[PDB]
Amino acid sequence: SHMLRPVETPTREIKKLDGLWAFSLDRENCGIDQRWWESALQESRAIAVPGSFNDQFADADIRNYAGNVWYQREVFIPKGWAGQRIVLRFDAVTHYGKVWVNNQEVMEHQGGYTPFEADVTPYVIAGKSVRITVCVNNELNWQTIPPGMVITDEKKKQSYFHDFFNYAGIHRSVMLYTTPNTWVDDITVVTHVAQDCNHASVDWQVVANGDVSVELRDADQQVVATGQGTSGTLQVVNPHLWQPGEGYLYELCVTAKSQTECDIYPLRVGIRSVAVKGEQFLINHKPFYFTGFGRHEDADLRGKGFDNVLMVHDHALMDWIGANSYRTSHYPYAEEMLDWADEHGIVVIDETAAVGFNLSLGNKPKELYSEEAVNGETQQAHLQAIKELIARDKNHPSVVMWSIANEPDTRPQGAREYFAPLAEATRKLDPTRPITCVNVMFCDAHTDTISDLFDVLCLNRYYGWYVQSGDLETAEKVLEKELLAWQEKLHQPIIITEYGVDTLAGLHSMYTDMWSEEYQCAWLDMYHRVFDRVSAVVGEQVWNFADFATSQGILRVGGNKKGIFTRDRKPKSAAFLLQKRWTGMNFGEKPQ
Amino acid sequence: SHMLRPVETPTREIKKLDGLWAFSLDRENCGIDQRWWESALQESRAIAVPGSFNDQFADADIRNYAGNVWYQREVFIPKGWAGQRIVLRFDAVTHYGKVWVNNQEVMEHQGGYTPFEADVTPYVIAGKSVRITVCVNNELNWQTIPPGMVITDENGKKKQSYFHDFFNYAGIHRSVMLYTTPNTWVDDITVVTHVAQDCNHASVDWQVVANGDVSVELRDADQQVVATGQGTSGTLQVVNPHLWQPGEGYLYELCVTAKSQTECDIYPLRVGIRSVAVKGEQFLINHKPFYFTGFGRHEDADLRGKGFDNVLMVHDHALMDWIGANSYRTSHYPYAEEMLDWADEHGIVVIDETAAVGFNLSLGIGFGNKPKELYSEEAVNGETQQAHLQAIKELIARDKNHPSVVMWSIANEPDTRPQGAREYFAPLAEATRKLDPTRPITCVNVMFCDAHTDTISDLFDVLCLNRYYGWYVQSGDLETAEKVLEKELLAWQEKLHQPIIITEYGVDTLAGLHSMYTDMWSEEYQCAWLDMYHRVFDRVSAVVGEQVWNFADFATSQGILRVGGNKKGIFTRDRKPKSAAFLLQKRWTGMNFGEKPQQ
């Protein structure tokens, strides 16, 4: 469970395994039987790690593959790591990985978007080359997060219920890292902030197999507070709060000392509180207004693979357009993104991979919550996905809210019985952040059965698109009516976590009609006018930052075209509309 | 009602009223009450006739208008027309027109796609200017061909609901004209061209309606008299006739003279000597099997909507000729007759279709709440069936003598699952055969009314299937699509043992979208998917034709399925070729003319 982000210290080294690996499909599904991990993969080819495997090859038969694929490389253990605790770590393997070091099985993970690792000290020798084999499986069933159904025809075909392509592979960094045989295994900080903002407290809890001391250092490396033992509270006079748009960070240096060994782990800490009060979202006791995007991890060639240039360029576009926030739609993002948000003061709604709990979007069993679909084991798997997300992200000050799912069908019998325990367990795992369950349009104010269990109303709305098609005048009436009915029903802060229309870049129309750039601008504008008239709306996240790949079908013109930007990051007209609205408002303040 | 195409003759003049007219919306619907026809339209603007009104103005509020609009111009009657029978003719007004000459109501017509006309002799004076007002209505209901529902919102604002996948363009789409005959005139002509098996003799029956003694002269393309006859009816014998053949279209001229004691009238009718017949699973033209290649089309272009235009007709025929197309279907309404004059002259084979699309509440195309029973008093009823019969009569009355027209399609993609379907269609099938016994009939078949489901195709002569396996279902999966397609065509061959024409196969293709994955919306998928259909067609002996959906990208109702319109074109709306145009060019110019390809 304990999952600290590897960082280089006087007591910790890292060796990235990113680069070219050997790669092989297993159409006969005989690689486990033939123990492929005991040899060089036969009939293999070069693949980039990190990256989705699907689009690296310009090959439809690989892109559409369902089953196991195999990655392998050789790596030299640094000579100096003799006597040291050596960990092998995968930041993310989509959706399942099993790992062998030479002929030793070392670890296994279900969940495509959070890290897994094993201590491999006993199975490697410092100064020698070792063989790493990974069996990666991209199949979804009713107990995976997200769910799906594999149909077999004779040949496997993956069915799934979410509007983004089922990219798979080693999407994020692989690495070896070291600790001493005494080490800091875990840290929780809780950051309290007086109402007047003129004092703050920092609770710590540490797990380590040796005596623990902590030093809190400011941005200038001046020690502002010190403590001892596994737990306690640091007092901070006149603290530099972590504020949206700035993101001042302290460093909590955790030392675990044995008589013989010592370990130093620096954790970035942003001093901020988050709370809902009535229909206001407060950060450091001040109302905040969310602007920005639903995103995806999606790009040409690399699929959902992490990439620094893309992270730099996309943050430069969000900065320029005046976005203050985003949501990790619809899975945990690369941790680098949360390190970025921490440092630049970007506000994040951190979401699990639990999209698709919904059989009514655009074969399938009769009852959504039943033994044959979302069941007891599904709910366990969902709890595990929430635990892994919070265990990874609990200390990121940029994360202001947990979204435990996107667009579940809450009409059917058993929805509330499924969600209640998940809402409760989320609050116990992290009491410091509000929780949400992002709401599908047809589960309206008069229909939805679970919104009372959550703190903030995150509504996905597309009136004037899938319904009242091309009619802004009717869409505006229906939208305003529904937001006010939500305000009346629950008196929670409302974030519109999804509003957008498919827009084909370069399609221009004097009739302002669907798919045109001019429609995208008129439709976003109508939404904005309505949001500004409703006092409960504390945010707006446009769907989507950029055009992204989907499953093939008649609704998707080479993918999802709701982007503000093209997949190659070129702006549509609507990017300039958002630039003016979001840079023209006062930072973090509801427009008028 | 008799409908000869106006032609200039020693006895007949024409004056086109095409040009700029005055135009006005009537948002309050007070134009009949205020008798707008009695003066200049009040708040008017210039509009081009012919043309759809919708896209001339770059104005969404006009494009999306439902109700009456008003057209008006002034025109001089030629001085020399004194003593002549003077007719005012509209080749087509979509969907309804009422016409006034000064303050006299002269005409009314329902049906957006065939001509109407009135004798206006008594209401004009030769050498003076008259005012022509037209009230044009674009509303569809359950008794219009095609059908629809007007939804009135809580504020009284009208929005047209309709069940077909093309934009409900309206206006004066085709030429308006005054024309003369003498007071004795040839009012009607039916020819039937019979052709011996050996093709070495032919007979030409004639029947004429006119208020005078009738003689005929049949002249060959060199203007040499090959046969003469007398009386309102009879048979001309033609030795070693130059048959009208697909790819050539040799035409004779049947000159009909009506002579009274005092005056006379000469009408030249172009006649192509050709027989059409179904035998088993073969479509025979001049006793020889024919294989159809080409397109489902639309009347659709930038700015003018469904308006007729000679440059478009010349350019599009040059594209069909280049690509090797030998045929098309008038999807989904009668086309401008100039198209059938072109087909006659160049030997292009045409499936002539009525405007009866939309008889189907279970598609995703078109556009409030649909009625639950398609064939009921509150939807397709007795009055609908009457209106459909009238649409078939008017089409045949116009097109009965075009040798290019080889088959009548009485509708496109009706829902034939309910019991009502056969009850509605059976009498329509029978009446079509009585109206013209010289051509086979069809009713074009929707994909979900499969060989195991459909209830009416036995009543027709040719199986015209509209199929899109690998698109709307088995999306992007050529392998499954191919199995399902082959299985269904063979099940149709077993069931009815008719000739099969695939009258629709196509996939949305965004010009310039390219993919190494050959996936939906790409130029590459369009090519791979048409190729898979071709391979299957060539393995099925009953398939006698292939008409690609569609010749060119065209406008539709706005919705989530349509990326600025229908992108199943082989060409873009501005007539630029997609990669698939070159695929079709190779298959269609590489086969033997009119002959089923081989594996």
UniProtKB/Swiss-Prot annotation, chain A:
- Recall the GO molecular function terms of this protein's record: beta-glucuronidase activity; carbohydrate binding; identical protein binding
Assigned EC number:
3.2.1.31
Query: Looking at the keywords, is Hydrolase present?
Result: yes
Q: Motif range for N-K motif?
A: 560-562
Active-site residue numbers: E407 (proton donor), E498 (nucleophile)
What's a BP term from Gene Ontology annotated to this protein? carbohydrate metabolic process
The pH response of activity is noted as: Optimum pH is 5.0-7.5.
Q: What is the activity regulation entry?
A: Potently inhibited by a set of synthetic compounds like thio-urea derivatives and analogs, and uronic isofagomine (UIFG) derivatives. Inhibitors of gut microbial beta-glucuronidases block the reactivation of glucuronidated cancer drugs, and thereby alleviate drug-induced GI toxicity.
Assigned keywords, A-Z: Glycosidase, Hydrolase
Disulphide connectivity of cysteines: none
Enumerate the NCBIfam families for this protein.
PRK10150.1
Q: How does it assemble?
A: Homotetramer.
Domains as described in the record: The N-K motif seems to be a discriminant that could be employed as a fingerprint to identify beta-glucuronidases from the large GH2 family of proteins.
Q: What is this protein called?
A: Beta-glucuronidase
What species does this protein belong to?
Answer: Escherichia coli (strain K12)
This protein's gene is called uidA
